[PDB]
Design an enzyme around this catalytic site. Structure first.
Site, short mmCIF file in Angstrom:
data_model
loop_
_atom_site.label_atom_id
_atom_site.label_comp_id
_atom_site.label_asym_id
_atom_site.label_seq_id
_atom_site.Cartn_x
_atom_site.Cartn_y
_atom_site.Cartn_z
CB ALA A 1 -8.18 -13.54 11.76
CB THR B 1 -7.67 -20.77 5.81
OG1 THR B 1 -8.45 -19.67 6.28
CG2 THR B 1 -6.20 -20.39 5.88
#
EC number: 3.4.25.1
Lengths: 201, 208, 237, 229, 234, 215, 245, 239, 227
Positions: free
Chosen positions: A49, A1
């Protein structure tokens, strides 16, 4: 990420990758990591998430209730403060999230960074994720407050591409967003396998 | 000490087409190195245009599938409508996150038809995060089934889906995965959801 | 706990406890408020003045925040509670939102609190009425009025307490555009409106003034005497 | 339970249930308390309705600690509750400070308990009035407590039936130089006034408090004192 | 005089007046009819409108795939009871995974409703119910009163001016067990029509029908969908 | 229940043409001691349901008490409805799972047999809430020793008769006695049929020790 | 039960709260209490209603702090509760801030408790009225008064209890603002009390006087002895006998 | 106004709310119970108020426990509440002490529960009376009656309802201590038929049940054919 | 004296009757439903020229597609409006879709009879809900007794009788939204005591494809020009 966001004369610019992995296995490469809280606020996800998605939905509903009650839109500082107060009461249980919150309000552009440990800091240039240390270099060498719109787009794309080149858990496509005074727009979604020939030659 | 979880195997797959959806699974229930049953399917009909598939720990699968049906009936009585596939996915996300600090050990896939009559596939993680896809495989042999779908459906690394082609592709990928995965394959159950409703099919696999 | 229903409906759909609270308010000392262009003015008439009393302890104009203040009429002990609730709410708002309150926000909070006491078990309504004045962040002056039943309104000028109807009649006539062009004129208007009721001249008047960026200032008796003398000199015309 | 107060103000500012409780108290049996230089004496009348009653089954004079004693006028059942609470309070004080409770502190706590029943929901005031005697710091004490919760410190007092005449008797006869024996004689003489029938050692009760503590006289000693008088 | 303000006061004659007033509340609702055969159960309801510009109030509710109810009296109490019934059916299906029998649901309703009629500062439920269900023992029609008493019926009518329908049903009981679905529906419609004033007639606007059966889930017909049942009447 | 203490060994079950048969031994072992040798681990719930449980014995007795009271209460009404085997299976699954999540499980494995409305039921419930159905069942070490023998027969001939199922039961008990350390030579059988529930025991198995002479 | 509820905390058709007026009517029968503020101190003077000959710090003056004292009028059994609450409030403030409490904060904290009883709960209010005196670094010597309804206000000379109106009129006549000392304040208190009591002449046994003063950086609260009140009474008698000539 | 709450004594020592509750039982249809040499028999006349109700509606005979039977009179909702209370008491006893509750114990517990409602103004007394019958191999046959006051007694034959006195007069003639259940089943139906008043209460139905050694200690409803035999005998006796 | 939960001899709760009596003292609100949208119009009672008209709001936004008009005791409607807003946001959070008008009306109406001896008395406020959902424009009415209905044209307040009488002849199923606005304004002009002057009235509409909208001044004079 890896997600980055920087602030310049014509507003805020946010860029993110799209890969999500579970261990060494790449679950997907079509994740949407810039969460669209409102027509006037933007948030990002890094870490868990599920935590990011859930708590930013809660933030969106609180913002809508505030706007309904007070007949005025919430500001960036207040929204970041709300998000910071909703995650301090689960401190130590195991949450993991780090988000930029981006907007434009009566005091101009706004870019805040909030994470689950407790930090909440305003700034002019941020990058979070595993591959953020690779984006700081390019972004710091190229950033100036008097950039033009196209130059800022190019800088964000190049920083994200260089981050995904050397990081293993970062990749996919580069999604770009621009926050202006009258709301945000979606600029582009460029595949890395084409930026490679665009840049190398 | 006491361990609240076991792994019972299982593989689930979903493919979304132009005007259909397909959800497939295997019917073997195992535990450790033993075989419990060979006739335990993992697909549950939610509505005349929505199917759900679960894999993982079996007790959580049973209780979760009962909770979902209770909530669907509650919604229909309160709102005088049948719940939509998007609404089902959005509600399942909240249900899954409610147990954040003692999670369900389940992998969930939802297939069906959206409001314009096109196929829809949503995939979940054990904590709640969901995403709309075009095809998705979960369970024991996800890592073996995913590259084949990426190659054949997505046309990756190469210089529309019919229903028959999708059926052949599903049968082929499970036939290939029965060869190499220990936990997978006694019989194959396929559910096709289309304009006329839900149809079912079964195929035979290896037994050893 | 005590869970008797104190206030209930009556034939013809009236709430008698709220009406009796209105009657309680209509016996307090008069309070007048005027909203000017760059100034807001509040004035109270002292019902009883004694030479053996300290004034600092019996003031009826309080400061809810650095930009919002209020005057009340009714039962003093109830006001002493409502004010200390509003102060805590102002501080909580400034903590959570990082911004000073709006006059409408705080008057809405006070109105909601006062309405919640006419629909609960084992409670009687608040016997107070309030005028709330302030300035917003954009520089706009604000005047609001709150009712023991829980309703609030915005006003140009207003009066509450005993004899409020006569002062409202006076203001309906003497409130014009030219009468509020400067601070002295606004203060004189407030004093003249109070003079329709108060006895013995300006010895029984408490007057307070707020401006755009300054805190509340209590005017000393000498300034009141100067203004009253000027108003009396204007009678020579 | 009822959550509203059963005692309220009268249009003239009187609390009427308290007046009724004192009306109940003024119809009880007489009690006398006298404080002397060496100790305190408490006396009460113990007439009973029949000869079938067991005279020694229940007592009116009771010890709270080794150095405190009680008598009462009013209703016996309320007196028992008050005695129980006073004993518990004294034990709590001892547990905290490792020292016997002084008389004034006990009277304050008991008066607080009696006042709680005047401003509480769904209960009526106690219908008893109490006399407390104790010995602390080398000197004696004598306190009275009322159904309202107000307590006073006395030298000599009478209570119950015909207590005004008893107060006049004590006023005309009490002197600050009496010893304990003269105090006992005066107490029995005061009880003699307005007595019905012939009094013996079985129908009066006496208790004394001095340096050794609080003790209740045995019937033999009461017989000796009655013979002396 | 003083025996009629509380639900915990006995009259000198051994009656509770608040229960009787709750009964009087039901008698002011619009009529409702329920009847059954060897294979089906049917509820017929007459709806009312405040004015020509207002829609007619609902009177048939879904409780479960094999249970439906019809209402007469206070609406909010009906909604409260209906939610309680739905929760009980859901709990039974969750724990045992089979439909709840109708009589065991009616027992629960009575048990719940009896409690308010005994404690201080509480009121009886001022709603009457007709319950139509089907289970392993066949069709069932139950009737419920505000006094927590319930009855098991062959046919029953409740509401205002419901004595005429009761007389019609008493006359025609014998044919019900042999009638098919259509004739049972027509019988219910005739019984309901017996309550209307002579100047008013049945129409698709003010008639609602609810049917449950052996191989038929509880279905509700309103508006144009009740036209086939009205056709051929009289 | 964090520790099992006194335990049972294994339960066997198989379905035939017109009912179900269940078998279990009569021993409660405390570790490796074989302490109680005449205990019964088979229950009759109602006129068409039977239950057999292995694992901790205190928990089995507790569930006997609860299930018996529930059946009696539901029978008192006299309304014409009775619990089927599937209702008992579902209720047991719910109870086991609800107790698992509190981190206080019931240490048992249970086999439910029944015959109602012309259809026979054989179900399996586990400690954690894993529940399912099969034509044949065995818990504990019987899952390794006896299950192959039952499944070999059931694949060739899907539908048995009563005598064949009985004989298969004794063969499986004999194998378990030979090869299991916590077994016993006295067992008990229960059969549910259109007539009702019938319990027979204690029984015994005939063994063969010829190989001891080729050593 | 609604039948036996007396409805203490409700309004009246005129907007009044009858229980509060009844409590205030009860207070108007207690003994007279008087408070005077001077330049170098403050004083409280109270009437002793216990005059039986057989009766055995002070009767109606209580010490709440190192710097404050109070006197009550009304029903004593409630005065005890209020005094015990005031002491605890002061100790809590000192524990939290490590400094003594100011006077007005203490008065406010008690009046909140007094008002809460009159607004809800179903119970009756407290029938007592208090006078507070003390010293404070922010404002100096102070004097406050409270009511059953929860109303307080500062004063320079005040009186509560029996015959309060006559005492207030006399104070208005005779009090000189800005020119008072303890020596003159004591004489004024003796004169007003003598003109208020229902006795031919005042006596030292019927009055108690307490003085709060600040010496050597410490507050001193002193209850005057009888032989000083006797001298004060003799001085007043001589001055009155020589007043008219 | 001494009769408005259950926590007030009349100036002569009476609690009127309990008497007003008894008047509710006194307006109900009669139920009788007879204890014999080897069992107990309950008999009720159930009035039918319309022809639309099914046969077997509003039953007044309950099964409290396997060995216990109950017969009620008065308000039916209160009776259906007390039946559930008794069921819970019996269940708790069996699950705590391991064996069936004796009838004399269940009666005492239910009686204390009923009496708990006649002391406070926050609740009202029950308006129901009832009978409990049981048979045990150790304790014989037992019959108990309970009252809205909470008083519990043991009887040889009892009747509750509007026609109580005539029914008791008829029961006193039976000499029931030497004959079995079969004769009692006919005699109860006979007594019920003679105590009924058909010119005011137009229609009724007979409901019978017993517990005894012929049922091996279980409480049951009388089998049909025996019921019609008893009905025919009673009708021909009435003729 | 009697409790809050006593029935009358003819089977009605006294407190609900008294609240319904209190409803008839409020200002007149009129709502009209057409296939093109829903319109809500309400009266303002300005008691003095020293008051600011813009501080009186009687038409609020429950959500972008649902609006409400209220009459009766105004201070009590705040709790109901707050509950309605919260329920709509909860529905969006859980199901990611917009609530319907009927569901909002049920959720608000379930609070009507939740009082006893928590609330101590009924609300005494009457509401009109106007919304657009999958079924089209819809107008609902809810009163203090807890009953809600669907309407084509409704008038609530002190002059409800004459307003409904006029709406009976005026209304027809084929009306255009502009005609509906004109008719509502004409009826309001008839029933008011003062003169309609684009300051003492309030008007709002909800139309498919666009959000809840509040008329400003200029549109008010433009529309009133024809009247």
């Amino acid at each position: 990420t890896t997600t980055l966001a920087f602030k310049f004369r014509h507003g805020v610019i946010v860029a993110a990758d799209s890969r999500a992995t579970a261990g060494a296995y790449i679950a997907s490469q079509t994740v949407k990591k810039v969460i669209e809280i409102n027509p006037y606020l933007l948030g990002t996800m890094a870490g868990g998430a599920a935590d990011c998605s859930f708590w930013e939905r809660l933030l969106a509903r609180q913002c809508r209730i505030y706007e309904l009650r007070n007949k005025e839109r919430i500001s960036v500082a207040a929204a970041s403060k709300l998000l910071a107060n909703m995650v301090y009461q689960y401190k130590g249980m195991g949450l993991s999230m780090g988000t930029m919150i981006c907007g434009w309000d009566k005091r101009g552009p706004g870019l805040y960074y909030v994470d689950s440990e407790g930090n909440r800091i305003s700034g002019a240039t941020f990058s979070v994720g595993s591959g953020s240390v690779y984006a700081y270099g390019v972004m710091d060498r190229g950033y100036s407050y008097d950039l033009e719109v196209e130059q800022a787009y190019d800088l964000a794309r190049r920083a994200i591409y260089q981050a995904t080149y050397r990081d293993a858990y970062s990749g996919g496509a580069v999604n770009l967003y621009h926050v202006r005074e009258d709301g945000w727009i979606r600029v582009s979604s460029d595949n890395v396998a084409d930026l490679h020939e665009k840049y190398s030659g | 000490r006491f361990s609240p979880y076991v792994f019972n195997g299982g593989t689930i797959l979903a493919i979304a087409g132009e005007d259909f959806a397909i959800v497939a699974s295997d019917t073997r229930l195992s535990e450790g190195f033993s075989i419990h049953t060979r006739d335990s399917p993992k697909c549950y009909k939610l509505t005349d245009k929505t199917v759900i598939g679960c894999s993982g720990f079996h007790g959580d699968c049973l209780t979760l599938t009962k909770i979902i049906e209770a909530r669907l009936k509650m919604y229909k009585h309160s709102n005088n409508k049948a719940m939509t596939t998007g609404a089902i996915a959005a509600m399942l996300s909240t249900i899954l996150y409610s147990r954040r600090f003692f999670p369900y050990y389940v992998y969930n896939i939802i297939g069906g038809l959206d409001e314009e009559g096109k196929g829809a596939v949503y995939s979940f993680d054990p904590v709640g995060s969901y995403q709309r896809d075009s095809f998705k495989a979960g369970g024991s042999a996800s890592a073996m089934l995913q590259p084949l779908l990426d190659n054949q459906v997505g046309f990756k690394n190469m210089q529309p889906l019919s229903l028959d082609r999708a059926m052949r592709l599903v049968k082929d990928v499970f036939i290939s995965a029965a060869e190499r995965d220990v936990y997978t394959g006694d019989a194959l159950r396929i559910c096709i959801v289309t304009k006329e409703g839900i149809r079912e099919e079964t195929v035979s696999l290896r037994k050893d | 706990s005590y869970d008797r229903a104190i206030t209930v409906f009556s034939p013809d759909g009236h709430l008698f406890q709220v009406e009796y609270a209105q009657e309680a308010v209509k016996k307090g000392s008069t309070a007048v408020g005027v909203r000017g262009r760059d100034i807001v003015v509040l004035g109270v008439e002292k019902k009883s003045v004694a030479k053996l009393q300290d004034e600092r302890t019996v003031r009826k104009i309080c400061a809810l925040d650095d930009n919002v203040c209020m005057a009340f009429a009714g039962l003093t002990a109830d006001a002493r509670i409502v004010i200390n609730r509003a102060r805590v709410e102002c501080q909580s708002h400034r903590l959570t939102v990082e911004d000073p309150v709006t006059v409408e926000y705080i008057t809405r909070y006070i109105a909601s609190l006062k309405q919640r006491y006419t629909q609960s078990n084992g409670r009687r309504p608040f016997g107070i009425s309030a005028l709330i004045v302030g300035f917003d962040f954009d520089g706009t002056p604000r005047l609001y009025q709150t009712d023991p039943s829980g309703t609030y309104h915005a006003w140009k000028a207003n009066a509450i307490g005993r004899g409020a109807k006569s002062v409202r009649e006076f203001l309906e006539k003497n409130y014009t555009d030219e009468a509020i062009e400067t601070d002295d004129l606004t203060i004189k208007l407030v004093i003249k409106a109070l003079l329709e009721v108060v006895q013995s001249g300006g010895k029984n008047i408490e007057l307070a003034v707020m401006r755009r960026d300054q805190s509340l200032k209590i005017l000393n008796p000498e300034e009141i005497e100067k203004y009253v003398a000027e108003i009396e000199k204007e009678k020579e015309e | 339970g009822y959550s509203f107060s059963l005692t309220t103000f009268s249009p003239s500012g009187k609390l009427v249930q308290i007046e009724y409780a004192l009306a109940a108290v003024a119809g009880g049996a007489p009690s006398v308390g006298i404080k002397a230089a060496n100790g305190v004496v408490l006396a009460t009348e113990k007439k009973q309705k029949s000869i079938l009653y067991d005279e020694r089954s229940v007592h009116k004079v009771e010890p709270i600690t080794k150095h405190i004693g009680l008598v009462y006028s009013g209703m016996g059942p309320d007196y028992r509750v008050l005695v129980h609470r006073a004993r518990k309070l004294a034990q709590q004080y001892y547990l905290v400070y490792q020292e016997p409770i002084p008389t004034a502190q006990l009277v304050q706590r008991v008066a607080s308990v009696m006042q709680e029943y005047t401003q509480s929901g769904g209960v009526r005031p106690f219908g008893v009035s109490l006399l407390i005697c104790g010995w602390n710091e080398g000197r004696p004490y004598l306190f009275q407590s009322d159904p309202s919760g107000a307590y006073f410190a006395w030298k000599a007092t009478a209570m119950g039936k015909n207590y005004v005449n008893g107060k006049t008797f004590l006023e005309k006869r009490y002197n600050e130089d009496l010893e304990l024996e003269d105090a006992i004689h005066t107490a029995i003489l005061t009880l003699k006034e307005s007595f019905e029938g012939q009094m013996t050692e079985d129908n009066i009760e006496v208790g004394i408090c001095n340096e050794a503590g609080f003790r209740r006289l045995t019937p033999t000693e009461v017989k000796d004192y009655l013979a002396a008088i | 005089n003083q025996y009629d303000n509380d639900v915990t006061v006995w009259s000198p004659q051994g009656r509770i007046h608040q229960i009787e007033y709750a009964m009087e509340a039901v008698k002011q609702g619009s009529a409702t009819v329920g009847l059954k055969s060897k294979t089906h159960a049917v509820l017929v309801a007459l709806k009312r409108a405040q004015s020509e510009l207002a829609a007619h109030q609902k009177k048939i509710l879904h409780v479960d795939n094999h249970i439906g109810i019809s209402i007469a009296g206070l609406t909010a109490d009906a909604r409260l009871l209906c939610n309680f019934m739905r929760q009980e059916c859901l709990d039974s299906r969750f724990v045992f995974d089979r439909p709840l029998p109708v009589s065991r649901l009616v027992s629960l309703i009575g048990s719940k409703t009896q409690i308010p009629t005994q404690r201080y500062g509480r009121r009886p439920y001022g709603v009457g119910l007709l319950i139509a269900g089907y289970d392993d023992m066949g069709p069932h029609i139950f009737q419920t009163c505000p006094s927590a008493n319930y009855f098991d019926c062959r046919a029953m009518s409740i509401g205002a001016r419901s004595q005429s329908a009761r007389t019609y049903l008493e006359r025609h009981m014998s044919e019900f067990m042999e009638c098919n679905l259509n004739e049972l529906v027509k019988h219910g419609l005739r019984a309901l029509r017996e309550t209307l004033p002579a100047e008013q007639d049945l129409t698709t606007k003010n008639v609602s029908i609810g049917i449950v059966g052996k191989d038929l889930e509880f279905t509700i017909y309103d508006d144009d969908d009740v036209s086939p049942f009205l056709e051929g009447l009289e | 229940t964090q520790n099992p203490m006194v335990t049972g060994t294994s339960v066997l079950g198989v379905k035939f043409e017109g009912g179900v048969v269940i078998a279990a031994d009569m021993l409660g072992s405390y570790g490796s001691l074989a302490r109680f040798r005449n205990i019964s681990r088979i229950m009759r719930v109602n006129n068409s349901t039977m239950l057999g449980a292995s694992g901790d014995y205190a928990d089995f007795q507790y569930l006997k008490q609860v299930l018996g009271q529930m059946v009696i209460d539901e029978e008192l009404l006299g309304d014409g409805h009775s619990y089927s085997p599937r209702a008992i299976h579902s209720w047991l699954t719910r109870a086991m799972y609800s107790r698992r999540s509190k981190m206080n499980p019931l240490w048992n494995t249970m086999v439910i047999g029944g015959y109602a409305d012309g259809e026979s039921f054989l179900g399996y419930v586990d400690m954690l809430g894993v529940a399912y159905e099969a034509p044949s069942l065995a818990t504990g070490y019987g899952a390794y020793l006896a299950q192959p023998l039952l499944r070999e027969v059931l694949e060739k001939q899907p539908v048995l008769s009563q005598t064949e199922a009985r004989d298969l039961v004794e063969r499986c008990m004999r194998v378990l006695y030979y090869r299991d350390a916590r077994s016993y030579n006295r067992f008990q059988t229960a059969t549910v049929t259109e007539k009702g529930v019938e319990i027979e025991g204690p029984l015994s198995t005939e063994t063969n020790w010829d190989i001891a002479h080729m050593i | 039960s609604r039948r036996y509820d007396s409805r203490t905390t409700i309004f009246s058709p005129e907007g009044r709260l009858y229980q509060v007026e009844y409590a205030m009517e009860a207070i108007g029968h207690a003994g007279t209490c008087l408070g005077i503020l001077a330049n170098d101190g403050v004083l409280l003077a109270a009437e002793r209603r216990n005059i039986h000959k057989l009766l055995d710090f002070s009767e109606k003056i209580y010490k709440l702090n190192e710097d404050m004292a109070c006197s009550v009028a009304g029903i004593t059994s409630d005065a005890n509760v209020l005094t015990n609450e005031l002491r605890l409030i002061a100790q809590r403030y000192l524990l939290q801030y490590q400094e003594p409490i100011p006077c007005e904060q203490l008065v406010t904290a008690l009046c909140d408790i007094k008002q809460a009883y009159t607004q809800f709960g179903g119970k009756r209010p407290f029938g007592v009225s208090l006078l507070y005196i003390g010293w404070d670094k922010h404002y100096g010597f102070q004097l406050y008064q409270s009511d059953p309804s929860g109303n307080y206000g500062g004063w320079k000379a005040t009186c509560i209890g029996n015959n309060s109106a006559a005492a207030v009129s006399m104070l208005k006549q005779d009090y000189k603002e800005g020119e008072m000392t303890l020596k003159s304040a004591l004489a004024l208190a003796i004169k007003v009390l003598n003109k208020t009591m229902d006795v031919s002449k005042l006596s030292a046994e019927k009055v108690e006087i307490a003085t709060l003063t600040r010496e050597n950086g410490k507050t001193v609260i002193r209850v005057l002895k009888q032989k000083e009140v006797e001298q004060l009474i003799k001085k007043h008698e001589e001055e009155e006998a020589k007043a008219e000539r | 106004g001494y009769d408005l709450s259950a926590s007030t004594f009349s100036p002569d020592g009476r609690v009127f709310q309990v008497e007003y509750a008894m008047k509710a039982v006194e307006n109900s249809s009669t139920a009788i119970g007879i204890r014999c040499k080897d069992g107990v028999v309950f008999g009720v006349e159930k009035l039918v108020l319309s022809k639309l109700y099914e046969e077997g509606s509003n039953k007044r005979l309950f099964n409290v426990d396997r060995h216990v039977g109950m017969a009620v009179a008065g308000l039916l909702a209160d009776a259906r509440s007390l039946a559930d209370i008794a069921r819970e008491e019996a269940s708790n006893f069996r699950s705590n002490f391991g064996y069936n509750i004796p009838l004399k114990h269940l009666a005492d517990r239910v009686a204390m529960y009923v009496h708990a409602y006649t002391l406070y103004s926050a609740v009202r007394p029950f308006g129901c009376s009832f009978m409990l019958g049981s048979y045990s191999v150790n304790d014989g046959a037992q019959l108990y009656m309970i009252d809205p006051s909470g008083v519990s007694y043991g009887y040889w034959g009892c009747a509750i309802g509007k026609a109580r006195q005539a029914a008791k007069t008829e029961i006193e003639k039976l000499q029931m201590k030497e004959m079995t259940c079969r004769d009692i089943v006919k005699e109860v139906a006979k007594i019920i038929y003679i105590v009924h008043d058909e010119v005011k209460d137009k229609a009724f139905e007979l409901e019978l049940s017993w517990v005894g050694e012929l049922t091996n200690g279980r409480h049951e409803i009388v089998p049909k054919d025996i019921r019609e035999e008893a009905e025919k005998y009673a009708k021909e006796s009435l003729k | 004296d009697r409790g809050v939960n006593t029935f009358s001899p003819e089977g009605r709760l006294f407190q609900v009757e008294y609240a319904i009596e209190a409803i008839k003292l409020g200002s007149t609100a009129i709502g009209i439903q057409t296939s093109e949208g829903v319109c809500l119009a309400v009266e303002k009672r300005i008691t003095s020229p020293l008051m600011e008209p813009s501080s009186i709001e009687k038409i609020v936004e429950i959500d972008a597609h649902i609006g409400c008009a209220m009459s009766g005791l105004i201070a009590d409607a705040k709790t109901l409006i707050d509950k309605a807003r919260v329920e709509t946001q909860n529905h969006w959070f859980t199901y990611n879709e917009t609530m319907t008008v009927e569901s909002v009306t049920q959720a608000v109406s379930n609070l009507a009879l939740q009082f006893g001896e928590a609330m101590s008395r009924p609300f005494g406020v009457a509401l009109l809900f106007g919304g657009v959902d999958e079924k089209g424009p819809q107008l609902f009415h809810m009163d203090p007794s807890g009953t809600f209905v669907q309407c084509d044209a409704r008038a609530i307040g002190s002059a409800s009788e004459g307003a409904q009488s006029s709406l009976q002849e005026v209304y027809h199923k084929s009306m255009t939204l502009k005609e509906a606005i004109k008719s509502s304004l004409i009826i309001l002009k008839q029933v008011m005591e003062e003169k309609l002057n684009a300051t003492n009235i309030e008007l709002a509409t909800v139309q498919p494809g666009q959000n809840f909208h509040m008329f400003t001044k200029e549109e008010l004079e433009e529309v009133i020009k024809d009247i």
